[PDB]
Amino acid sequence: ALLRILKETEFKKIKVLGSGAFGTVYKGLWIPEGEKVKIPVAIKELRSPKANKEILDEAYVMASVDNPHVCRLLGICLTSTVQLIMQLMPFGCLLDYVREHKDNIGSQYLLNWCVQIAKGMNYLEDRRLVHRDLAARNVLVKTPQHVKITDFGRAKLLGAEEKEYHAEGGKVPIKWMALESILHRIYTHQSDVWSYGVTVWELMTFGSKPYDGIPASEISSILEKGERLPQPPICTIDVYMIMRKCWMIDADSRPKFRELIIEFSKMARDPQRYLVIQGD
Numbered sequence: 499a500l501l502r503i504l505k506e507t508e509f510k511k512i513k514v515l516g517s518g519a520f521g522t523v524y525k526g527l528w529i530p531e532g533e534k535v536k537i538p539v540a541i542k543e544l545r546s547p548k549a550n551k552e553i554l555d556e557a558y559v560m561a562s563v564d565n566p567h568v569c570r571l572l573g574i575c576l577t578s579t580v581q582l583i584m585q586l587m588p589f590g591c592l593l594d595y596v597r598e599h600k601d602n603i604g605s606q607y608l609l610n611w612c613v614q615i616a617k618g619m620n621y622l623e624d625r626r627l628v629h630r631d632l633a634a635r636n637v638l639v640k641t642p643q644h645v646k647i648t649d650f651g652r653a654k655l656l657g658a659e660e661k662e663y664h665a666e667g668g669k670v671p672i673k674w675m676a677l678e679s680i681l682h683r684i685y686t687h688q689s690d691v692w693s694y695g696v697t698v699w700e701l702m703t704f705g706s707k708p709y710d711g712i713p714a715s716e717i718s719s720i721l722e723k724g725e726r727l728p729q730p731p732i733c734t735i736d737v738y739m740i741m742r743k744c745w746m747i748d749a750d751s752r753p754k755f756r757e758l759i760i761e762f763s764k765m766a767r768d769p770q771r772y773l774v775i776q777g778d
């Protein structure tokens with residue numbers, strides 16, 4: 499995967515898909531100059547600018563991320579704005595998907611999603627990328643059978659010598675963060691594992707809100723006292739204990755994504771043994 503540069507004439511915005519501080523995402527059509535083919539795309543138009551060279555170099559890095567469970571950057575357009583042209587995931591974010599189809603989602607799909615997200619997170623770790631924003635809202639659905647992680651700008655590349663990322667002032671998704679990230683602004687692959695654990699909890703509760711109604715400011719205190727998100731109704735204890743492992747104080751006591759791939763793959767071979775869903 500390489501970074502190609504698009505001219506504004508090459509693509510068209512059709513419809514708004516979402517937005518935030520980062521910018522706005524549109525459903526779009528990309529027609530590579532002279533290729534007479536329509537490619538469905540999601541166009542991310544980002545909100546003192548960096549130099550064009552800096553932006554392209556970062557974009558070259560992003561485009562090199564090539565894994566079945568990470569949403570790929572296909573190209574970039576630099577005009578007055580930065581526009582990132584990404585793969586269009588037909589079924590939207592996974593959070594909305596599980597809420598919408600909760601009556602018709604079985605154990606096989608849930609456990610397969612856990613495997614796939616772990617696989618994508620493991621790939622990012624191999625690339626020395628800490629995500630720092632993993633949550634069901636940031637996983638996308640290619641098909642009910644296939645999901646992809648995406649990134650809205652919080653991810654950081656660790657240099658050869660860096661074992662962690664030390665954050666600055668940016669706003670933080672408190673209820674998804676590891677205790678050490680909240681307390682000391684330290685992020686690692688193992689703090690992504692904590693977030694992976696919360697993400698799994700979201701899936702297993704069909705998109706329920708973590709620490710529902712509790713102010714984010716009280717979260718560090720609750721975690722420091724040893725409280726964690728509750729066992730979801732459909733979860734056998736074996737599955738809940740994996741989640742609980744993701745939330746242990748010592749980051750190095752938490753499983754690594756490679757280990758989570760193995761564990762969930764094992765469960766996914768006998769899904770009804772590990773998740774209990776009526777009519778499944």
Ligand SMILES: *CCC(=O)N1C[C@H](COc2nc(Nc3cnn(C)c3)nc3[nH]cc(Cl)c23)[C@@H](OC)C1
Nearest residue numbers: 515516517523540584585586587588589590591635
């Ligand atoms: C739960 C989070 C959410 O609703 N978001 C909306 C928006 C989506 O960004 C992308 N959307 C798609 N496909 C899509 C969306 N809706 N349908 C029906 C299909 N594909 C993408 N590929 C890359 C990105 Cl980014 C998107 C996000 O807003 C922040 C998350």
